[PDB]
Design a protein around this ligand. Structure first.
Ligand code: GDP
Ligand code: GDP
Ligand code: K
Ligand code: K
Ligand code: NA
Ligand code: NA
Lengths: 176, 185
């Protein structure tokens, strides 16, 4: 009765769209975001998710676009609603700076596998949102200084965002 | 840097209280709940966390007291506020039916390692709460039918809950009428 629907992106090869089922009742809802048996097989040989992170952001925050050459991510929204965006940031890739966007909320609980070399970003449409992502990497976590950054509104990517004036960090402004 | 403070409980042998650091700014906060390196080492050799669950509950929900002899859990609240309760349900333990309570919210981001053979429960004080817990087990996941349930209001445990009138499932109500039969499989 714990189930996953696992579909590969039609737009970006190697991006996976994972949808869990849920048990809903008078108290709320219960669901499984991840099992090693269901999801780690999607990663390359020798790699498993080993790191769980939470981001709680206020309305009209954008975070991104962030990535590095080794870190795989599995991302969703576990409270509120986001626009989740994946960008192919591999400079050798024929689909370099193509993107895909997912509107994620409790009724659309897509979970996105973001490969290494892809950029990751989200926008908060709700009053606030809690972003959940898992990381898979060998050796050390790649912190912000060693990551690449693209501007949320880079004209090459041309993302359709629901904001014309987001709340950003200095990193994400420097990128613009 | 990503940091953890890890303390064993002073009350219940085997329970760990894990506290992350957070980066806070104008946008909100970022934090790490788990790394294999930091936390999987607290489990038995050969066992790792391999399952992630979310429970979103409305105000005044209780869930519990649920447990099984194989499954280790790592639990916190990632939105809202709960009263998280661990019960030692190991019948051999000197602290059998003793409990520890943690009020968990964004300013008190404790993450509780609940060992196999313990009972797990929580109550939602906020308008709603999102409960996050990881599971570590060999073999198949232990679903509701193969778990034990202790009554939320069992007077041998004597949990100080903030209400006498929580919202409960049929499973958690039925436990209040089967005290003494928690182990029946
Ligand atoms: N789809 C799905 N169903 C689940 C999951 N976890 C539990 N259930 C089902 O949800 C119901 C309640 O399970 P239980 O563990 O009693 O929930 P609790 O009372 O919140 O601990 C049972 O029917 C379970 O089979 C899950 O992760 N996914
Ligand atoms: N304590 C802690 N700091 C973090 C974590 N992740 C990122 N940071 C720090 O938070 C700040 C912003 O990081 P960045 O990756 O730009 O955050 P983003 O803008 O949300 O992607 C940087 O100083 C990071 O070192 C974490 O999990 N825990
Ligand atoms: K793998
Ligand atoms: K271990
Ligand atoms: Na694989
Ligand atoms: Na160990």
């Amino acid at each position: 009765a714990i189930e996953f629907n696992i579909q590969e992106s039609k737009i970006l090869k190697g991006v996976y769209i994972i949808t869990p089922n849920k048990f809903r009742d008078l108290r709320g809802e219960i669901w499984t975001a991840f099992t090693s048996k269901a999801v780690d097989k999607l990663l390359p040989n020798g790699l498993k998710f080993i790191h769980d992170k939470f981001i709680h952001s206020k309305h009209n925050v954008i975070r991104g676009i962030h990535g590095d050459v080794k870190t795989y991510k599995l991302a969703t929204c576990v409270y509120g609603e986001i626009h989740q965006v994946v960008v192919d940031c591999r400079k050798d890739s024929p689909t370099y700076l193509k993107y895909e966007k997912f509107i994620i909320n409790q009724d659309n609980q897509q979970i996105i596998l973001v490969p290494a070399g892809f950029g990751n970003a989200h926008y908060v449409t709700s009053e606030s949102a809690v972003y959940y992502y898992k990381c898979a990497y060998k050796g050390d976590y790649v912190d912000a200084p060693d990551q690449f950054t693209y501007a949320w509104n880079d004209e090459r990517i041309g993302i359709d965002w629901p904001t014309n004036s987001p709340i950003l960090s200095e990193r994400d402004i420097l990128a613009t």
